[PDB]
């Protein structure tokens, strides 16, 4: 899951860069925020589909699960808040390597594995192994969420 | 002075510094060298992503082309050590401004515009205007290579 880890880390970095330029407005849906990012070329290493020519581009992970970058309650009478990067249907093995990798990378403000929100951004191999669920045949059953300031 | 030109100049100085700091080993692929540079924070502000082949982070210029920082190994006849910075899909306008700008203040040991290698590190706008090819629609057709210490 080396490519996958690098993809989420860079997507986060690109998103932070893009958000530093937004002022006076905020994204109200992941669909729009994700399409804008794709338009800027912030997701080159991932699978892009949907309809980018119409501003409706969608992002996918290596296993065909959807990836969505969405605002995290944008609005605080000041500066832009945070956002989340959610990746779906992640297989068990990948879920463990990706969640622990993002923890070690240290750039998030929180990592979630299914219904487990590690707001301290610390996820160990022992924690991941337990929280990441078994695949259903060849289909991953894990949803990972990476948060980013806040 | 502009963002684009500055990007190349900061990339070069950061790479010179990184190579100087390496002790006991050497890069053998642009994939690895560029990843390390990105991990070193040398490309903050530029678009980055992940390479499905190696899992390494990739770097991307202002027009959608890739930027690859690679070490200069042995080319069966080549011996100009150091490294090169290659950027593709460069629009004609940028090709002329960037190549000339790098000639003026890039501190290179050579500048190549497509199949023209200015080993004296001197490129004038008259030359660049001729060597840089026209765009295909909004797509740039130029490849620039900045050679460092050969």
């Amino acid at each position: 899951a080396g490519t996958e880890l690098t993809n989420y880390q860079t997507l986060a970095t690109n998103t932070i860069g893009m958000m530093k330029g937004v002022d006076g407005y905020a994204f109200t849906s992941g669909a729009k925020m994700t399409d804008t990012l794709i338009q800027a070329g912030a997701a080159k290493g991932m699978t892009v589909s949907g309809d980018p020519a119409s501003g409706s581009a969608t992002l996918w992970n290596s296993w065909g699960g959807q990836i969505v970058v969405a605002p995290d309650t944008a609005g605080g009478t000041g500066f832009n808040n945070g956002f989340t990067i959610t990746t779906n249907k992640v297989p068990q093995s990948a879920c463990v390597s990706i969640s622990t990798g993002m923890s070690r990378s240290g750039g998030t403000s929180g990592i979630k594995i299914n219904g487990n929100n590690h707001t301290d951004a610390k996820v160990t191999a022992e924690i991941a192994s337990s929280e990441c669920t078994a695949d259903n045949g060849r289909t991953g059953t894990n949803t990972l969420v990476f948060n980013y300031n806040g | 002075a502009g963002t684009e030109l500055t990007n190349y100049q900061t990339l070069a100085t950061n790479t010179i510094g990184m190579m100087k700091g390496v002790d006991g080993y050497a890069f053998t692929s642009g994939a690895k060298m560029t990843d390390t540079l990105i991990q070193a924070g040398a490309a903050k502000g530029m678009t980055v992503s992940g390479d499905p082949a190696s899992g390494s982070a990739t770097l991307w210029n202002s027009w959608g082309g890739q930027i690859v920082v690679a070490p200069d190994t042995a080319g069966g006849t080549g011996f100009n050590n150091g490294f090169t910075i290659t950027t593709n899909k460069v629009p004609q306008s940028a090709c002329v401004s960037i190549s000339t700008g790098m000639s003026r203040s890039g501190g290179t040991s050579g500048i190549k515009i497509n199949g023209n290698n200015h080993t004296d590190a001197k490129v004038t706008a008259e030359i660049a205007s001729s060597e840089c090819t026209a765009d295909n629609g909004r797509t740039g057709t130029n490849t620039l290579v900045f050679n460092y210490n050969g």
Binding site: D35, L37, I38, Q39, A40, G41, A42, A43, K44, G45, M46, V48, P52, A53, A57 | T47, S49, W60, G64, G65, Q66, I67, V68, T86, N88, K89, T139
Partner: peptide, 10 residues
């Protein structure tokens, strides 16, 4: 990446 980001690459 998406529109921004040619198909070529390097």
């Amino acid at each position: 990446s998406x529109d921004x980001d040619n198909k070529e690459x390097x």
